RNA sequence: AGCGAAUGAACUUUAAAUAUGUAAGAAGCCCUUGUUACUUAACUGAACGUGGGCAUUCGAAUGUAUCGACACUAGUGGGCCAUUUUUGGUAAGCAGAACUGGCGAUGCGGGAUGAACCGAACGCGGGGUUAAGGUGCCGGAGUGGACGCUCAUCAGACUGGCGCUCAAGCGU
């Protein structure tokens, strides 16, 4: 439970953060750009044949 | 993050609901769904989970 | 003997995560944004915009 | 191709000690999500300046909204069509209320008569004809005239197709 | 030059002698040598084929063969490794030691000051 | 790309794409010292004897329902098609090399029959969703929507037949 807690509040806060620090590198006359993807999801999509 | 990933077993999938692109066995930049789609990733997640 | 999904059947759910009865009851879920004035764009950025 | 976007891709080098802080290229592209509008813009940055994906990266994608959606306007864009013989420049009139649905007109009507794909069309600029008389298109030209009126003769009325015998014969008077 | 018998040997074939040279197949190749006579030298080469690997016995004399410069990574590695394991173990503190795979980048800032962007188009008039 | 650097594809600060060999510690590392049947002017190297410390990133990733050796036992030695790279000739086809994938030994959905080619590879069933291909009728599913073009005295069909023309044709 205590565990939850922490998680469910640690996206909220990452979401948040990537929010604010875009919207006030663009206020600053800059481009805040974001950090890239550390995880990626595939999927095989075609038969095993040829 | 190695033994999270390698104790999952694959992901079974079913097939998507709504169906692929009209041609799928291309890049998504053509208009297929090979490839890199990045966030667009998650709208195949939901037909497909 | 039977795989139930914790999406549909919500005694799974409070099974594997106990978090699941206040995360619904204290809508954290539905959580607003940070109140006060927000500033305008700056013109800068608007010139950039709609450029040549 | 679908729902175009006008999208601001800026991207630049990456930064090295040699050549630190680069010069932030910046360019329009008309594409339906933006991970074509990137790949687009690095397929030009290859082509113009010889900065490539693997040695770059993307600053900024933004979507450039119709300041003005509910006017309607003059288009004239400029176009580069790599044909069977060669590459040929072309220049269009467009009568739309944005952008966008003239560059999707545009890519229709050389579809249609051209038969030119969306790898093989440059989109050069695309312009908005602001004083009366820049449009040369007679088409368009017509459209531009002095209180226009016309009627609409044989308008087919709209039956459910899935209405098959009827017992009136129908009228075109609507 | 001077080679043993052991040694990690690649092979590059001029067209100066024509005299003992090998197939294209062994054209830039590297193998390890187990013979050596007044001109020529043995060398053990892996082999594909279909499936599975075969060990072929070739004879190329010196100006094509050299020693290869593909182990020394071993060696430094190895030296290094020992050596900041060894100043880890006399300063207490924990240090890192295998290659890392060079993770994706990080989230930062680039100025507009300085450095405002300029418009393209996809042909350069000028 | 540059040569507002030198020099001149053979120019180069930088550096593609594209494929292919080798190495990624314990069967390991380094250095110091004796011996040897070897080697060289000579530990110049090689082998046999040295020592040290590293088992809590023991020295990338990912997979691992495992691999090596020894011994024993059946059936087989066709060719064809396609791709990538390369050489030569002909009026044009074509001829010579390596490569993988398949057929022989393969059923199913499409493909107008076949075959090639596309999808996908097979226990017996129920439900759901798709691939390739399709939605005027035969034939299950749209006479669906937006923009243009075409009337052809045997048009055209991502046509088989009927047939179709602000398409049931073509491009998106």
Not at chain 1, 5 to 30: D, F, M, N, P, T
Not at chain 5, 27 to 53: E, M
């Amino acid at each position: 439970f205590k565990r939850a807690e922490k998680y469910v509040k640690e996206y909220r806060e990452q979401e948040r953060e990537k929010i604010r620090l875009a919207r006030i590198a663009k206020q600053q006359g800059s481009f805040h750009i974001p950090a890239e993807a550390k995880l990626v999801f595939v999927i095989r999509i075609k038969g095993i044949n040829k | 993050f190695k033994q999270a990933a390698n104790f999952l077993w694959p992901f079974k999938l079913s097939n998507p609901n709504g169906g692929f692109r009209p041609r799928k066995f291309k890049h998504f930049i053509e208009g297929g769904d090979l490839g890199n789609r990045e966030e667009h990733i998650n709208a195949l997640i939901r037909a497909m989970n | 003997v039977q795989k139930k999904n914790p999406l549909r059947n919500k005694q799974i759910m409070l099974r594997l995560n106990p978090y699941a009865s206040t995360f619904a009851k204290e809508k954290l879920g539905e959580v607003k944004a940070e109140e006060g004035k927000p500033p305008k764009v700056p013109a800068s950025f608007k010139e950039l915009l709609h450029e040549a | 191709m679908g729902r175009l976007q006008e999208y601001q891709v800026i991207g630049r080098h990456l930064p090295t000690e040699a050549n630190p802080n680069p010069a932030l290229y910046r360019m329009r592209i008309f594409a339906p999500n933006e991970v074509v509008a990137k790949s687009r813009f690095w397929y030009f940055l290859r082509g113009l300046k010889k900065v490539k994906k693997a040695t770059g990266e993307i600053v900024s994608v933004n979507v450039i909204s119709e300041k003005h959606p509910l006017k309607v306007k003059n288009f004239g864009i400029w176009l580069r069509y790599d044909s069977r013989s060669g590459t040929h420049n072309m220049y269009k009139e467009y009568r739309e209320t944005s952008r966008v649905a003239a560059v999707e007109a545009m890519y229709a009507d050389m579809a249609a008569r051209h038969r030119a794909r969306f790898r093989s069309i440059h989109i050069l600029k695309v312009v908005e004809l602001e004083k009366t008389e820049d449009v040369k298109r007679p088409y368009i030209k017509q459209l531009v005239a002095k209180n226009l009126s016309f009627p609409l003769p044989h308008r087919v009325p709209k039956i459910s197709t899935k209405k098959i015998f009827s017992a009136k014969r129908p009228s075109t008077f609507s | 030059r001077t080679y043993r018998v052991g040694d990690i040997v690649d092979i590059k074939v001029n067209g100066a002698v024509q005299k003992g040279m090998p197939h294209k197949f062994y054209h830039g190749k590297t193998g390890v040598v187990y013979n050596v006579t007044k001109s020529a030298v043995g060398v053990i080469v892996y082999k594909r084929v279909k499936h599975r690997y075969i060990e072929k016995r070739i004879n190329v004399r010196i100006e094509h063969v050299k020693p290869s410069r593909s182990r020394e990574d071993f060696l430094r590695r190895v030296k290094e490794n020992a050596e900041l394991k060894k100043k880890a173990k006399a300063e207490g503190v924990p240090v890192q030691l295998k290659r890392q795979p060079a993770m994706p980048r990080e989230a930062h800032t680039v100025s507009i000051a300085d450095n405002k962007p300029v418009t393209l188009a996809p042909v350069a008039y000028e």
